[PDB]
Amino acid sequence: KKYKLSEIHHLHPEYVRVSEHFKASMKNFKIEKIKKIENSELLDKFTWKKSQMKEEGKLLFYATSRAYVESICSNNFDSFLHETHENKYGKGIYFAKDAIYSHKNCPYDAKNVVMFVAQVLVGKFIEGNITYTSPPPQFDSCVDTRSNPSVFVIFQKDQVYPQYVIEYTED
Q1: What's the rounded Cα separation, in Å, for the pair 105 and 45?
Q2: Which helix (H) or strand (E) holds 33?
Q3: What's the CATH code of the domain at 72?
Q4: Number of domains in the chain
Q5: Phi-psi group of 76: left, alpha or beta (phi > 0 → left; psi -120 to 50 → alpha; rest → beta)
Q6: What is the rounded distance in angstroms from the CA atom of residue 23 to the CA atom of residue 29?
Q7: For the PARP catalytic domain, which residue ranges apply?
Q8: What string of DSSP letters covers 34-96?
Q9: Closest among 47, 20, 14 to 161, alpha carbons compared
């Protein structure tokens, strides 16, 4: 097993911060649990890539089925296996600035949905294009818009570290 998941108590400061970030857009919802992911092999790849890119992680959202938790936590997000978003901005993994975007676009029954939070290295971004299977040269990600970027399309696993899994329900 490549990873460990650990529940964070709801009064721990790390839970509070993750919850505030989620609730910034997820108004009508309560958090049932937050677990932190540790996977040293994924973390080491991400740390190296961050240094290479000259970038800092940003926490972005990714809604999926509970069925994929073990796979993502051990092997990272995979465009082919995982991605449900329509190809609007390129054939990569679609991360959201706002949790509600990932929530409302997820195709799974609410009883199956979990919200990942991932550290993502976005680097230099450009508007995406449906014909892109990688960003243009000198860009590291694609977006919906450069002036209000709210979806980030990532084409390499080492730009991502799965960090938290959030279980939530309507409230």
Answers
A1: 29
A2: strand 29-38
A3: 3.90.228.10
A4: 1
A5: left
A6: 8
A7: 1-171
A8: EEEEE-HHHHHHHHHHHHHHT---EEEEEEEEGGGHHHHHHH---HHHH--S-SSS-SSEEEE
A9: 47
Q: Which amino acid is at 130?
A: I
What is the C-alpha to C-alpha distance for residues 30 and 82, in angstroms, rounded to an integer?
25
3-state DSSP call for residue 4?
strand
Method of structure determination: X-ray
Token pair recorded at residue 10: 């709801």
Rounded to 5°, angle at Cα 50 from 167 and 64: 25
Q: DSSP 3-state assignment of 24?
A: coil
User: Quick one: resolution in A?
Assistant: 1.0
Contact indicator for 8, 34 with CB cutoff of 8 Å: yes
Q: What Å distances lie between residue 53 and 120, 126, 139, CA to CA? A: 12, 16, 11
Phi, psi of 103 (to 5 degrees): -55, -55
Containing structural domain, residue 155? 1-171
